């Protein structure tokens, strides 16, 4: 069995310590640790040690990472994507693998990805991402959400396909906009929860609906979550309507989400209202950070650097204080892991030995400066140095 002693690192505002790793777990933390015989030594040189970063919401199947630049002349964005996939030979396999490897090189060791599951492609995108997940076993842990991007109710056979996706290895059921997309919100929520209940799985639902319509759909989702006892098994992604509502109605919904263990994903889009990270926090709602798309036919933006996403969340929420920047960093570390149900997380003994070293004086500096990951350790193995896989 292999041991790794990372000497002389800082977890933040605290004295420096060493981190002893054995197998895939953190074995010991503290100052001036003894070295087990034959243990490898890594000199941390006073760097900040971070737990493995977490991508709580992306779309690995859609990315053009590693491909030639996608020239965007979109006007109409759902029909553009479908035409691209039906006139190009896009391979969710090489793309998802390249992007997930870039995530790893930048210190992200846990990823929740949505994958399109629909009657245009069947399970083809799912199978490609499952291949990528198997290639990266022991290197990146990947949760897969089976996402009916173009809807369920109006597309015959989509319900059975989503069930097939869960049976084939998708971890979570996805879905979207029970009013705006599905047209029959009660039927849509009942169909989706029925499928997830059959496989005993959780759900992560895209909710773009604005204002009172979004609040209505959210209420329906939370009602069903409570009725089925699906505690800590439902995630709401985007949830823009929480930025539209009066504070009274907003906090009542957030209170219900906190009670049910429902987390919210924010990707901090700069041009639409977002849930206030501090309002969620004050209500007891866990906030998960995510990129959303990364260089696909929807968006040219996105990055495998989750420190950059933390920075963008902080900017979007008008954070300036150091402790507010640390709240944003929590959205791509402990908060994202808690919200997504990523277990054995952190830098304490017994946690999975995911360790990311960065040259920064403070956690707040690491958020805004995004220093290169000097070292990435994943499941106790050194996988990257100076931002590149070794
Ligand atoms: Cl298929
Ligand atoms: Cl602030
Ligand atoms: Cl920790
Ligand atoms: Cl600090
Ligand atoms: Cl740097
Ligand atoms: Cl990096
Ligand atoms: Zn989105
Ligand atoms: Zn999304």
Q: Which stretches of the chain are DSSP H helices?
A: 77-85, 92-105, 124-135, 158-168, 185-199, 211-227, 241-244, 247-260, 277-283, 306-316, 322-330, 334-340, 363-369
CA-closest candidate to residue 100, choices 389, 317, 390: 389
Residue 81 Cα, ligand 2 centroid: separation in angstroms? 38
Structure tokens at 46: 């006073």
Which among 274, 384, 386 has a CA at the least distance from the CA of 331? 274
Q: How far is the CA of 283 from the centre of ligand 3 (A)?
A: 23
Locate 151 and state its tokens.
């809807």
Structure determination technique employed: X-ray
Instruction: Kindly tell me the sign of the dihedral angle through the C-alpha atoms of 187, 188, 193, 199.
Output: positive
Residue 268: Cβ within 10 Å count? 22
292 is in an annotated binding site: yes
Given a contact cutoff of 8 angstroms between Cβ atoms, the answer to whether 302 and 103 are in contact is no
Q: Which ligand is nearest to the CA of 58?
A: 8
CA of 371 to the centre of ligand 6 (A): 7
d(CA 165, CA 122): 9
What is the distance between the terminal CA atoms of the chain, rounded to a whole angstrom? 21
CA of 167 to the centre of ligand 1 (A): 12
For ligand 3, the distance from its centroid to the CA atom of residue 387, given in whole angstroms, is: 22
- Separation CA 324–CA 362 (nearest Å): 13
Which ligand has the shortest distance to the CA of 106? 6
Ligand nearest to the CA of 204: 8
- List the beta bridge partners of residue 238: 207
Domain boundaries, the chain: 1-52+345-390, 53-344
**Cβ neighbours around 41 below 10 Å, total:** 11
Question: What's the reported resolution, in angstroms, to a tenth?
Answer: 2.0
> Which residues are within 8 A (CB) of 93 and not within 5 positions of it... i.e. 6 or more apart?
128, 129, 131, 132
How many angstroms separate the alpha carbon of residue 102 from the centre of ligand 5? 16
232 assigned binding-site residue? no
131 CA to middle of ligand 6, Å? Answer: 25
Q: In the chain, after which residues does the backbone break, taking C–N over 2.5 angstroms as a break?
A: 75
* CA separation, residue 335 to residues 1, 101, 191, 357 (Å): 31, 23, 30, 19
Torsion sign, CA atoms 93, 97, 103, 108: positive
Residue 270's alpha-carbon distances to 33, 73, 312, in angstroms, are 46, 20, 9
Helix H, strand E, coil C: the string for 91-153 is CHHHHHHHHHHHHHHCCEEEEEEEEECECCCECHHHHHHHHHHHHCCCCCEEEEEEECCCCCC
Find the ligand nearest to 205 CA. 8
β-bridge pairing 3-9 and 40-43: parallel
The structure tokens 């199978």 sit at 127
SS3 annotation, 154-185: CCCCHHHHHHHHHHHCCCEEEEECCCCCCCCH
Question: What's the CA-to-centroid distance between 350 and ligand 4, angstroms?
Answer: 23
Q: Is the Cα torsion angle 340, 345, 346, 348 positive or negative in sign?
A: positive
Distance CA(210)–CA(273), nearest Å, equals: 9
Closest ligand relative to 14 C-alpha:
4
Quote the ligand 8 centre to 58 CA distance (angstroms): 6
Around 41, how many Cα atoms within 13 Å sit in the side-chain half-sphere? 11
51 C-alpha to center of ligand 3: Å?
7
CA distance 55 to 100: 10
φ/ψ of residue 12, rounded to 5: 150, -135
114 annotated among ligand-binding-site residues: no
State the distance from the centre of ligand 1 to the C-alpha of 304, rounded, in angstroms: 29
Residues at Cβ < 5 Å from ligand 8 ion:
292
353 Cα: distance to centroid of ligand 3 (angstroms): 11
Residues with CB under 5 A from ligand 7 (ion): 292
């Amino acid at each position: 069995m292999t041991a790794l002693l990372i000497r002389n690192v800082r977890t933040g505002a605290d004295d420096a310590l060493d981190i002893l790793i054995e197998g895939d777990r953190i074995a010991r933390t503290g100052p001036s640790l003894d070295a087990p015989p034959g243990c490898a030594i890594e000199e941390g040189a006073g760097a900040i040690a971070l737990p493995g970063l977490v991508e709580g919401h992306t779309h690995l199947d859609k990315t053009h990472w590693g491909m030639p630049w996608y020239r965007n002349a979109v006007g109409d964005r759902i029909e553009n994507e479908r035409h691209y996939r039906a006139t190009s030979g896009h391979d969710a396999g090489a793309a998802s693998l390249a992007l997930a490897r870039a995530f790893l090189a930048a210190g992200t060791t846990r990823i929740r990805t949505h994958v399109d599951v629909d009657t245009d492609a069947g399970l083809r995108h799912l199978h490609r991402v499952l291949d990528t997940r198997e290639t990266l076993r022991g290197q990146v842990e990947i949760q897969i959400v089976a996402f009916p991007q173009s809807g369920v109710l109006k597309r015959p056979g989509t319900d059975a396909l989503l069930a097939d996706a869960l049976a084939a290895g998708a971890d979570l059921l996805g879905g979207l906009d029970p009013c705006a997309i599905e047209g029959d919100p009660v039927k849509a929520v009942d169909v989706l929860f029925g499928i997830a209940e059959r496989y005993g799985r959780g759900l992560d639902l895209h909710l773009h609906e604005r204002g009172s319509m979004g609040a209505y759909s959210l209420d329906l989702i939370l009602q069903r979550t409570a009725a089925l006892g699906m505690q800590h098994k439902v995630t709401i992604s985007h949830a823009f309507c929480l930025g539209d509502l009066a504070e009274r109605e907003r906090d009542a919904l957030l209170a219900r989400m906190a009670e049910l263990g429902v987390a919210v994903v924010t990707t901090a889009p700069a041009a639409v209202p977002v849930p206030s990270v501090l309002a969620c926090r004050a209500a007891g709602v866990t906030v998960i950070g995510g990129n959303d798309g990364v260089r696909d036919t929807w968006t040219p933006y996105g990055s495998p650097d989750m420190l950059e996403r933390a920075m963008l969340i902080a900017m979007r929420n008008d954070f300036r204080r150091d402790d507010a920047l640390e709240v944003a960093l929590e959205c791509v570390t402990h908060g994202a892991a808690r919200g997504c149900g990523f277990d054995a997380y952190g830098l304490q003994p017994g946690a999975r030995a995911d360790v990311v070293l960065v040259d920064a004086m403070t956690l707040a500096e690491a958020v805004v400066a995004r220093p290169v990951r000097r070292l990435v350790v994943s499941s106790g193995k050194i996988v990257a140095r100076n931002g590149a896989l070794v």
